[PDB]
Amino acid sequence: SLTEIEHLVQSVCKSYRETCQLRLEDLLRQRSNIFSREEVTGYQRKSMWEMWERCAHHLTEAIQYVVEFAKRLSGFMELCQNDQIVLLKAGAMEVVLVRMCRAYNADNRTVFFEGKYGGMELFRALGCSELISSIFDFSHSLSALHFSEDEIALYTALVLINAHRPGLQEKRKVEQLQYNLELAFHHHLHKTHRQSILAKLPPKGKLRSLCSQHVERLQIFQHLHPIVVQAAFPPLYKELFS
Ligand SMILES: O=C(O)c1ccc(OCc2c(-c3c(Cl)cccc3C(F)(F)F)noc2-c2cc[nH]c2)cc1F
Structure with a gap:
């Protein structure tokens, strides 16, 4: 079923186009729009807890777009609810972190944040400099690959659809979706002469560890200073x- 695989590609890429938040062309064109030193100081002088509220709300929105991404993947809504939740709990923030590389400019080590590009020093008031450095470093590693939009879409589909997540109830059903996505990704890389990125993808456990550290910090902040969430997915x- 060759066209089936070429189907799944178009459908992962449609889901991704509909949920990617900002177009890559817009992110690239705005690269020259950089926060001034005056604007940087304004962010650095904010309360910890206000910077936390702003960042938490951007991250909640990013997670919701990833959930919508998964929901639109052919086969995902056919998984049982328990397995949908297991997969999204374990992988949605991993996908958010990967998606960040599109908004990262390796030339000056800046990220697109609230309308302009700024470096790590923008987030000083959060007092999380080690975690922020790890996020910038990771985005720097991914940015060297020059991920295309379909590569990010297919790669992040596989971040989510991982039959190894503990707690799955219909593991063979997740495996079938995983195998088809893996074939789609590998067929696409062969067609575009991009199989060389396979050896350059983040090693096993590196995205897991960064995400674990990230979510643990978000949990601490939410314990100390809970944000109100525009909750769309109760389970x-x-x-x-x-
Ligand atoms: O709309 C919803 O129903 C809805 C459900 C869950 C959700 O989870 C976000 C989230 C957060 C997070 C964030 Cl983004 C900001 C502040 C605090 C937290 C934390 F740590 F307290 F949970 N951290 O990890 C995740 C996550 C989700 C799937 N895997 C990981 C967000 C939603 F909008």
């Missing part, structure tokens, strides 16, 4: 919030 919200 998933209930797994992350208490």
